[PDB]
Design a protein around this ligand. Structure first.
Ligand SMILES: [Mg+2]
Ligand SMILES: [Mg+2]
Ligand SMILES: [Mg+2]
Ligand SMILES: [Mg+2]
Ligand SMILES: [Mg+2]
Ligand SMILES: [Mg+2]
Ligand SMILES: [Mg+2]
Ligand SMILES: [Mg+2]
Ligand SMILES: [Mg+2]
Ligand SMILES: [Mg+2]
Ligand SMILES: [Mg+2]
Ligand SMILES: [Mg+2]
Ligand SMILES: [Mg+2]
Ligand SMILES: [Mg+2]
Ligand SMILES: [Mg+2]
Ligand SMILES: [Mg+2]
Ligand SMILES: [Mg+2]
Ligand SMILES: [Mg+2]
Ligand SMILES: [Mg+2]
Lengths: 88, 129
RNA sequence: UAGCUAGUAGGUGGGGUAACGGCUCACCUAGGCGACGAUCCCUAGCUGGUCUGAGAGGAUGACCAGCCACACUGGAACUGA
RNA sequence: GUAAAGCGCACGCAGGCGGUUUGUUAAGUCAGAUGUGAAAUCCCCGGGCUCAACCUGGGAACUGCAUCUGAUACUGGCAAGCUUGAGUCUCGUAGAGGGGGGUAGAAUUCCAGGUGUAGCGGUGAAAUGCGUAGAGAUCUGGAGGAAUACCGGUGGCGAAGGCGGCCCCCUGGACGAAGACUGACGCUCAGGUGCGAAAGCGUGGGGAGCAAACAGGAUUAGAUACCCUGGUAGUCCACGCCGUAAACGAUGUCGACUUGGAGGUUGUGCCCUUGAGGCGUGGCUUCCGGAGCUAACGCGUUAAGUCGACCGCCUGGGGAGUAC
RNA sequence: CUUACCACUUUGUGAUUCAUGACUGGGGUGAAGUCGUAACAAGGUAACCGUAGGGGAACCUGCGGUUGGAUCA
RNA sequence: UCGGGCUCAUAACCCGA
RNA sequence: AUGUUU
RNA sequence: GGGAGAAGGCACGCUGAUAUGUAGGUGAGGUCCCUCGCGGAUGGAGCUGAAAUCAGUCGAAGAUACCAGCUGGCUGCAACU
């Protein structure tokens, strides 16, 4: 997984408030990260029909939690995705 | 439960008395009490206490007579995805009037009696007996 | 039977009907319908009601009454409320 | 669960379902009013035929549809939240979880050389087969492929299939500890997508051992077998395909509850720790069994008990999971 | 008289459905026919599921799996 | 082929000619 | 191996 | 990929209008701009010029001449050029 030194960084950048691991801004970023990284890893082997599942489980959550914004505070949704370019 | 609350409530009690349990407990909720009143005030439970101004807790003190339990015939009805509603000329009558069916009428929830007595229908609930 | 549909779906103006409307025409947009099941295949006149049944339900629509359609077959208009 | 019947397993769109508090709305719903639901059947009471059949008065009824005004408990919508659901952060915990790359020792086969000689091998016996062109055994050197003894276990991990020497790299999940943060963001899921034992299929590699096919030998009345001697595909690898299994707990998933007993394994708090140990509390796991459930066998807090949400499926046997 | 629309009707080519068809796959019945004995007991090689190959037939054999398997393994 | 045996009885198997 | 008789 | 120009059909001349010749094509002045001219932008004079739709019309016939696949169905063989 992402280095312990990593998550603690991204959070202080996306976390709705100074140092907080829970809000979508923080949730998403923390997820998209491991997703972008693993992408390369999977570009290798590509036979790990197990590790890939996790890739899905978390990715399936990305689009999932991302909806919470719409269903709730939409004002940030677009402001959050525009950050990682997600959705496209 | 992780879907329909009230459903568990009615169960908790029927389960407890099933094994001569003292008094089962469950997280109190406004609707839970409205159905609780129709128990203590309708002869079915000693009484219910509270606990937690933010994290409440219902406390239905079960009962038993001779060598058997009191509320030994309870079941839910207007469950989710199957909610039942009926008019005055359709109102229930648990076990030939011998029993009672909690009914959430527009004028608060109350026993089957208060239904006709007040003249109106409501979201039928369980079949206490 | 999983796709279906150009007067097809809508918009303008002409024309038309007792009257609204692609009803029809010209032009314009490229719609409209579909699994809450279109299109296609088989079947059937519809209802009050009738039979059965504890009820829910199932089966049915003869004679009575309301509605619809048909009149040797296919097609058309004339008169006239 | 075994009588017919749980998709082999996951993810997830639509769809269905939704912890908790307040405010609001009043759509679902409840109340009353009104139009309207033809008449006649029907039914209640009551008349006319001498009765009855039949005829007939009134009323009820016609679940219905809509509208008007009210009710606001629950349901739904909107606003505002809250935290126990679920999720992130920190620190650790165990493990055959996965993919890749190296490497190790034991053993068989083969090849080579020495020693040594008339048997070896196999079976119920035999025979085929291998031996004097010197096998077998015994010792020395080499090649190669596949598998990882002991550990090892009712042990562990994984969605399932399934996954064992050792080391490294990349990487998924689970679990416990304190709090911190999120604030219902969840459950299930037709369709859709992905994974799929073994055999099998395509291309190219690989090939020690085992072995469909096949060939001998034997058994037998026959023996297209069981047994012996050999032995090709395959079993191995890389990529692609097929998607089946008694894909089995023959028991869908999630959540809530309901006596207990012994053991396994894996976190964590604590007790002269003052012992191995003594007392707690969690995750997963075997055997037993209580009420209950069950046609019975049996299941029994990891239910087949008592409840709820969603989905899959069953509806006599053969024909047939066949035909088109 | 002319044009437009359109009926009977003509032509081509498909779809569909019904009937029939030499011969033929598998299936079902029926006369104490012929060949075996595969299965139910440890059925005398434990059986069954997938799958693959083979054989007069039941079936045999290979690979994995299940117990819905007998004995003191 | 036949005659005898083996079995509850067949075949097979065993004996004899 | 079978007996409606390997 | 094909089989396929499968098959089988409809329309084809000319005149007028839309439009005095249309869409399109080509692009001269005049204006503007800047290395500053074999510049560009803009301008649209002229030139050229398909095709469609209407309406009307001559013959027996408008792809009128030359030119220019016959088409399908069953089967052997050999992949195919
Ligand atoms: Mg108009
Ligand atoms: Mg008819
Ligand atoms: Mg009945
Ligand atoms: Mg007519
Ligand atoms: Mg069954
Ligand atoms: Mg299953
Ligand atoms: Mg009526
Ligand atoms: Mg509300
Ligand atoms: Mg497990
Ligand atoms: Mg394989
Ligand atoms: Mg192969
Ligand atoms: Mg037990
Ligand atoms: Mg036929
Ligand atoms: Mg047998
Ligand atoms: Mg056997
Ligand atoms: Mg026989
Ligand atoms: Mg016989
Ligand atoms: Mg010939
Ligand atoms: Mg040739």
């Amino acid at each position: 997984s992402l280095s312990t030194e990593a998550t603690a960084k991204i959070v202080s950048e996306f976390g709705r408030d100074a140092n907080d691991t829970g809000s979508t801004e923080v949730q998403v970023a923390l997820l998209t990260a491991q997703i972008n990284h693993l992408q390369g890893h999977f570009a290798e082997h590509k036979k790990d029909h197990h590790s890939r599942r996790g890739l899905l489980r978390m990715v399936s959550q990305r689009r999932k939690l991302l909806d919470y914004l719409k269903r709730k505070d939409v004002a940030r949704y677009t402001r959050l995705i525009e950050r990682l370019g997600l959705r496209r | 439960s992780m879907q329909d609350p009230i459903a568990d409530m009615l169960t908790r009690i029927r389960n407890g008395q099933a094994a001569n349990k003292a008094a089962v407990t469950m997280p109190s909720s406004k609707l839970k009490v409205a159905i609780a009143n129709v128990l203590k005030e309708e002869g079915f439970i000693e009484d219910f206490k509270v606990e937690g101004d933010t994290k409440p807790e219902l406390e239905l003190t079960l009962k038993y007579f001779q060598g058997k339990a009191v509320v030994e015939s309870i079941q839910r009805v207007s469950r989710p995805g199957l909610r039942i509603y009926k008019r005055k000329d359709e109102l229930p009558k648990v076990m030939a009037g011998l029993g009672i069916a909690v009914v959430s009428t527009s004028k608060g929830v109350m026993t089957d009696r208060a239904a006709r007595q007040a003249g109106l229908g409501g979201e039928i609930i369980c079949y206490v007996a």
